[PDB]
Design a protein around this ligand. Structure first.
Ligand SMILES: CCCCCCCCCCCCCCCCCC(=O)OC[C@H](COP(=O)([O-])OC[C@H](O)COP(=O)([O-])OC[C@H](COC(=O)CCCCCCCCCCCCCCCCC)OC(=O)CCCCCCCCCCCCCCCCC)OC(=O)CCCCCCCCCCCCCCCCC
Lengths: 70, 171
């Protein structure tokens, strides 16, 4: 009956689920287990480039805390 | 024209604040509360002199007063501050609203062990007055002498001598 249409809906729904799950996991893989930095404005990009310079390893997502000062 | 005057590389050596932006954003309100005076002296000097080369030493004081800010966190409250800037650091927009309980623990530990009150909504955006001993720049734009204006009109307006004086017209 009407549950015969549910396999196609399941296949299409898994295919719609894949891109968002993929970009979430790829953003966490490419950015140190965290969200991708959102730089819409030049202050956010300024702090991000500051992070890339203060990390020492040319990666903004490598965070440096109190241990990096004396 | 003339030679530009750059300071030496020794005049640019200072102990850098080598922390990430989420460390700075997590400590930002207490940094504005505690490191008020040398920051505002520097920014007053920076908007008045309009030259960073005239603003190095005050800038060094900023980089001196930030570090003493962090050591005073690092001595007393390293655990709630670390646990708070890590949670600030997770967010891609670095939201304060995602991290209110780590903020509350950091504010509790700081207010107990250091007595710092976090600034309320509206306070860090106030325009404050700064008492400095450096002089006011009398010519901050390095403007030269301005040209003298044309002489203005003066005198009561008399009629035209013999009218228009156009070829044969008498008025
Ligand atoms: C108590 C309180 C009250 C007190 C009241 C006191 C007064 C009482 C009387 C009341 C009436 C006063 C009238 C005004 C004062 C006299 C003005 C005068 O005669 O100036 C002479 C004027 C200058 O001669 P002037 O001897 O050196 O000066 C004598 C005075 O000192 C002139 O004095 P000014 O030196 O101070 O004048 C200033 C200056 C003096 O002039 C100049 O500095 C030189 C430049 C003048 C213009 C030249 C233009 C040339 C190219 C265009 C030519 C156009 C074609 C000519 C006409 C074609 C036909 C229409 O005038 C002008 O530039 C204005 C232009 C001329 C207008 C004159 C008045 C016209 C009013 C009636 C118009 C009717 C149609 C007239 C014909 C149209 C052409 C004007 O003569 C001419 O330019 C020659 C042409 C004649 C002009 C008109 C004459 C007025 C009487 C017309 C009656 C007939 C009408 C017939 C029907 C219509 C036409 C078919």
């Amino acid at each position: 009956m009407w549950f015969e249409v549910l396999p196609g809906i399941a296949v299409m729904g898994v295919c719609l689920f894949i891109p968002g799950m993929a970009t979430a996991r790829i953003h966490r893989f490419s950015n140190g287990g965290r969200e991708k930095r959102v730089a819409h404005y030049s202050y956010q990009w300024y702090l991000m480039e500051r992070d890339r310079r203060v990390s020492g390893v040319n990666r903004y997502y490598v965070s440096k805390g109190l241990e990096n000062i004396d | 024209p003339g030679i530009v005057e750059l300071p030496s590389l020794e005049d640019l050596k200072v102990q850098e604040v080598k922390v990430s932006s989420s460390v700075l954003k997590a400590a930002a309100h207490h940094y504005g509360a505690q490191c008020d005076k040398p920051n505002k002296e520097f920014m007053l000097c920076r908007w008045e002199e309009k030259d960073p080369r005239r603003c190095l030493e005050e800038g060094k004081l900023v980089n001196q007063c930030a570090l003493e800010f962090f050591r005073q966190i690092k001595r007393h409250c390293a655990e709630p501050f670390t646990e708070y800037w890590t949670c600030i650091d997770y967010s891609g927009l670095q939201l304060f609203r995602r991290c209110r309980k780590e903020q509350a623990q950091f504010d509790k530990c700081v207010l107990d062990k250091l007595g710092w009150v976090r600034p309320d909504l509206g306070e860090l955006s106030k325009v404050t007055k700064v008492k400095t001993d450096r002089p006011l720049p009398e010519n901050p734009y390095h403007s030269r002498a301005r040209p003298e204006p044309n002489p203005e009109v003066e005198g009561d307006l008399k009629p035209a001598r013999h009218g228009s004086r156009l070829f044969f017209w008498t008025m």
